[PDB]
Design a protein around this ligand. Structure first.
Ligand SMILES: NCCCC(O)(P(=O)(O)O)P(=O)(O)O
Ligand SMILES: [Mg+2]
Ligand SMILES: [Mg+2]
Ligand SMILES: [Mg+2]
Length: 322
């Protein structure tokens, strides 16, 4: 173990969806149906169960019913399969050209007909997209497809950095995980689980800031938990602890300690944003009682996502949690 986990700022206790065991059973079955287990070259069933994405989603989406949790869990099974698949098939061989082609096919499985799927990533996305889109607005649809594409562009950017040996500097790292990282995608599914953000406030600064603080915080937390795997097994350079470490030339523990202080700070700004800036713009735009409740449902969702996410990271076999 390369460093000891720091003292985390954890103000709000996590809650756990009672449909957890339902989500587990369904998603493991769905994974095999998509071809993500034996024969994938990526996961065996034992891997998927040890990662425990049912537990992740039950922690991060505590209030939705059994069917919603099952769909969300499949989404996360898919997003992590895509991550480990891309690593195993393209990153470890630094196959930038084949990676590009792989990624270029995936938008064909998010129509705003579809081709036949040739791999589990394509198969999973096709399935999820058809199951999810009918329940949401046409506007959520366009935003969610964009968010999913950003995730895809992220893998490319990361691979190119690995291939050229270039670690991003601290501002570059943050801005890149903001622009193409998976926080808007996660927040996209929080809306599915809670309510879509009223368009009257969706593009305003306080909701933008709310997303910035949410994004920074979730990535920095994961960086702390996955540094060991990423640095001494994967060769992944997209990690905040590694970014500070190379920039300052400090010890691993020193960088993790500062990363965590940055994390606590982002969490502070989230709380302030959620409590003050967002309610203010809700008044300024004259949202109805119903619209205000949707906003509150969503921001509350982000809070529970973060608290649950930490409890998951402390348990999943993906991470440095002893
Ligand atoms: N799509 C899921 C993202 C997975 C990660 O969180 P992990 O540390 O678990 O590998 P990332 O690769 O972004 O660091
Ligand atoms: Mg990744
Ligand atoms: Mg990863
Ligand atoms: Mg990580």
């Amino acid at each position: 173990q390369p460093f000891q986990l720091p003292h985390f700022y954890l103000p709000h206790p996590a809650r756990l969806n009672p449909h957890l065991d339902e989500a587990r059973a369904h998603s493991t079955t769905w994974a095999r149906e998509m071809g993500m287990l034996e024969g994938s070259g990526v996961w065996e069933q034992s891997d998927l169960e040890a990662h425990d994405y049912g537990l992740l989603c039950a922690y991060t989406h505590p209030d939705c019913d059994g069917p919603a949790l099952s769909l969300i869990t499949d989404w996360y099974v898919w997003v992590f399969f895509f991550d480990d698949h891309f690593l195993e098939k393209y990153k470890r061989s630094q196959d930038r050209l084949a990676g590009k082609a792989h990624l270029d096919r995936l938008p064909l499985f998010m129509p705003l007909g579809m081709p036949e799927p040739r791999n589990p990533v394509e198969a999973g996305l096709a399935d999820l997209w058809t199951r999810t889109v009918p329940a949401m607005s046409a506007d959520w649809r366009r935003r969610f497809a964009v968010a999913t594409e950003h995730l895809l562009n992220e893998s490319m950017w990361e691979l190119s950095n690995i291939n050229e040996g270039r670690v991003a500097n601290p501002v570059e790292y943050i801005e890149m995980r903001r622009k193409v990282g998976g926080a808007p995608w996660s927040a996209g599914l929080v809306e599915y689980a809670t309510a879509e953000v009223p368009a009257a406030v969706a593009g305003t600064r306080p909701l933008r800031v709310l997303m910035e603080t949410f994004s920074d915080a979730v990535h920095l937390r994961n960086d702390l938990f996955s540094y060991q795997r990423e640095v001494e097994d994967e060769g992944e350079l997209s990690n905040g602890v590694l970014v500070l470490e190379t920039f300052f030339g400090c010890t691993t523990q020193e960088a993790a300690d500062l990363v965590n202080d940055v994390l606590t700070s982002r969490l502070h700004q989230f709380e302030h944003t959620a409590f003050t800036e967002v309610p203010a713009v809700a008044l300024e735009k004259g949202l109805t009682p119903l619209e205000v409740a949707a906003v509150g449902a969503y921001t509350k969702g982000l809070q529970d996502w973060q608290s649950g996410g930490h409890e998951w990271h402390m348990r999943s076999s993906r991470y440095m949690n002893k």
